[PDB]
C-alpha cells in the first residue's frame, strides 16, 4: 500500500505531475539512461507518495554536469 498524492488514474500522470513540479528538466541522451535508472529502480520515483523525493532526485539529475549543457 503506497499513498497516491494525486487524484486521477493514469500511467503518464506521474511524469506529467513531476515535470509540472520540477519544470523543464530537458534530460540529455546520457541523462535519458540515468533517468530510466533513477525513475524505475528507486523507491522515490516508484512510489506515488514519494513524488517530492522523486522531484528532488530528477531535478538533481537535470542540474548534474551530464544534463547541464551550457
UniProtKB/Swiss-Prot annotation:
It comes from the Eukaryota. Belongs to the ALKAL family. One of its GO terms (biological process) is positive regulation of neuron projection development. Its main location: secreted. The keyword Transmembrane helix does not apply. Keywords: Cell membrane, Cytokine, Disulfide bond, Membrane, Secreted, Signal. Disulfide bonds join 31-67, 45-54. It is found in: Secreted; Cell membrane. Cytokine that acts as a physiological ligand for receptor tyrosine kinase LTK, leading to its activation. Monomeric ALKAL1 binds to LTK, leading to LTK homodimerization and activation. In contrast to ALKAL2, does not act as a potent physiological ligand for ALK. Widely expressed with highest levels in thyroid and moderate levels in stomach, trachea, small intestine, prostate and brain. GO terms for cellular component: extracellular region; extracellular space; plasma membrane. The keyword Secreted applies. GO terms for molecular function: cytokine activity; receptor signaling protein tyrosine kinase activator activity; receptor tyrosine kinase binding; transmembrane receptor protein tyrosine kinase activator activity. This is ALK and LTK ligand 1.
Amino acid at each position: 500500500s503506497r499513498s497516491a498524492e494525486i487524484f486521477p488514474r493514469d500511467s503518464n500522470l506521474k511524469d506529467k505531475f513531476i515535470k509540472h513540479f520540477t519544470g523543464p528538466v530537458t534530460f540529455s541522451p546520457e541523462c535519458s539512461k540515468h533517468f530510466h535508472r533513477l525513475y524505475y529502480n528507486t523507491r522515490e520515483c516508484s512510489t506515488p507518495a514519494y513524488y517530492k523525493r522523486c522531484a528532488r532526485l530528477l531535478t538533481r539529475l537535470a542540474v548534474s554536469p551530464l544534463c547541464s549543457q551550457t
